[PDB]
Amino acid sequence: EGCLEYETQLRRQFSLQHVRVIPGDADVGGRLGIGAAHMLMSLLQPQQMLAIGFGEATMNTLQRLSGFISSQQIRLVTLSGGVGSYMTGIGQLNAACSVNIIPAPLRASSADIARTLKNENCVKDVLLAAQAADVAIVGIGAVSQQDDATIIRSGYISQGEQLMIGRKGAVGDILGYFFDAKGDVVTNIKIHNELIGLPLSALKTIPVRVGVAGGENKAEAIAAAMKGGYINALVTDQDTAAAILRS
Amino acid sequence: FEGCLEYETQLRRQFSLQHVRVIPGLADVGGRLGIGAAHMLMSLLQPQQMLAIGFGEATMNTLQRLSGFISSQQIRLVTLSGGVGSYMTGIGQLNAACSVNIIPAPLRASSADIARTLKNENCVKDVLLAAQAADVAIVGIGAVSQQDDATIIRSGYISQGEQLMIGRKGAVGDILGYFFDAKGDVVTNIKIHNELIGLPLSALKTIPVRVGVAGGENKAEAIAAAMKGGYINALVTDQDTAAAILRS
Ligand SMILES: CC(C)CC(=O)C(O)(O)[C@@H](O)COP(=O)(O)O
Numbered sequence A: 001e002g003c004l005e006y007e008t009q010l011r012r013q014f015s016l017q018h019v020r021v022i023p024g025d026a027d028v029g030g031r032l033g034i035g036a037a038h039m040l041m042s043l044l045q046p047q048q049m050l051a052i053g054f055g056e057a058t059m060n061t062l063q064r065l066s067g068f069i070s071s072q073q074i075r076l077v078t079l080s081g082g083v084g085s086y087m088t089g090i091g092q093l094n095a096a097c098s099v100n101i102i103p104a105p106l107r108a109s110s111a112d113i114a115r116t117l118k119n120e121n122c123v124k125d126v127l128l129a130a131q132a133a134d135v136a137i138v139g140i141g142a143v144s145q146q147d148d149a150t151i152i153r154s155g156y157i158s159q160g161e162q163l164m165i166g167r168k169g170a171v172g173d174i175l176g177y178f179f180d181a182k183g184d185v186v187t188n189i190k191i192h193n194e195l196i197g198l199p200l201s202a203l204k205t206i207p208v209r210v211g212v213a214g215g216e217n218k219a220e221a222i223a224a225a226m227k228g229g230y231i232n233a234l235v236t237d238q239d240t241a242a243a244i245l246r247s
Numbered sequence B: 001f002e003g004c005l006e007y008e009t010q011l012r013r014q015f016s017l018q019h020v021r022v023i024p025g026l027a028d029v030g031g032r033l034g035i036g037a038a039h040m041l042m043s044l045l046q047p048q049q050m051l052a053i054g055f056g057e058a059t060m061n062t063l064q065r066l067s068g069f070i071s072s073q074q075i076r077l078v079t080l081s082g083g084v085g086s087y088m089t090g091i092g093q094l095n096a097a098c099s100v101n102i103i104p105a106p107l108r109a110s111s112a113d114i115a116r117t118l119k120n121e122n123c124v125k126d127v128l129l130a131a132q133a134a135d136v137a138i139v140g141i142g143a144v145s146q147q148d149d150a151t152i153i154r155s156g157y158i159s160q161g162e163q164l165m166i167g168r169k170g171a172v173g174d175i176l177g178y179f180f181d182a183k184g185d186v187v188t189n190i191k192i193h194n195e196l197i198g199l200p201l202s203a204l205k206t207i208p209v210r211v212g213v214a215g216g217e218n219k220a221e222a223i224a225a226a227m228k229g230g231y232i233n234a235l236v237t238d239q240d241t242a243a244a245i246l247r248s
């Protein structure tokens, strides 16, 4: 319904490997989890390793994917710290499920503390495992969401921080790393050296990296994520796909 | 004379416990401990109360038996220790209505200064406060006598050389990685103690009901010391262990 054509155009414009565009009406957050869970069911082979990001679209996707995770013995690994944030999509599975979790906060209070935690063995071990995954699933945050962004509502940055990240040219983020409209990570940003998880440069080792995000206010962030290479597959909705293509 | 019901009463009066269950020593030990211990916690937890959960085999076994109850009675759970991952056997199996509060840190830091830094991060401190405020705790008890079989060795939280020195220094057992001597006092000069991130035993004692779940005759000295120090005020154990504790 224009969805096949959007998929084709996004695929070619951003040189993607896989794309799914969901129709334009009741539950978009929810049909996005379904769309992405389907895409993951078709990419993942039994016993493969899935690296999981933070936030609402990803947790929604994981809840929907749980019987597939058990049935196919998929191994999960956290791309980010914070632990507890993942209990909604993990308080959800079974004890035979291998779940590999970074045992640290998502963001440390100083960059020196982030570097110390990243060198602890039990942390370093999981960071390697995550970079070795077969597929990644991640959300995409947008500066233009303002107070509605997950990163603000969770408390991981302050409003003052968000304002300055915007002033500095960032349009969006993956895993708390903010990039400009061309897709380059923005240089001068305190949270980037405080985060404990895998940097975006390392996420790119994973061969299939699926972003799941929608809402027209995310269109610029999603375009820039693709231009930067962070994701090479996308699950989004029809209005957002339109907006992305005109960006 | 005697039997399990007599050991229960005697353990209760000798160590001033609030609750005790001794399961008969016939099938599967750790499995039946798990079941005994879940029934005990099913009697103690009122709806929407908070349970603080320790580390190791008997606690994880217990939690698994407790899931239906945890979900149906809306029990909130909070980790007494760091380490995060170890905790996914027993809480793995729970609805998403389940409030599970987890210390977002390793179980043991590589240095005391790193442990002090992590305890002071806000997301860590907040959970350490919630844990200390729990209504009921469930912990296991480790013993120096178990040597290579001790969960603490098998999981790699201490080395063999550490264990030998801990024993040379007079320790008999541990709760949450903290090693105490035969009278129930924490042994003072032990490196792991200042590298652990979770709640110290002094703070564990704020929780009003503290259930230890442990079995095997090699643990009898550790379990007795644990009660003498006051760390647990309730016990789930097996018949032979109970008999050994009593002749301790
Ligand atoms: C890492 C976290 C602090 C921020 C983050 O991951 C995000 O990239 O901002 C992510 O939350 C966006 O996804 P949604 O929560 O689905 O909007």
Ligand SMILES: CC(C)CC(=O)C(O)(O)[C@@H](O)COP(=O)(O)O
Residues within 6 Å of the ligand: B054, B055, B056, B057, B058, B059, B081, B107, B140, B141, B142, B143, B151, B152, B157, B174, B175, B176, B177
């Ligand atoms: C904190 C952990 C490293 C050690 C610990 O808690 C413990 O007390 O030794 C515990 O493992 C003993 O319980 P069991 O594993 O059931 O024998």
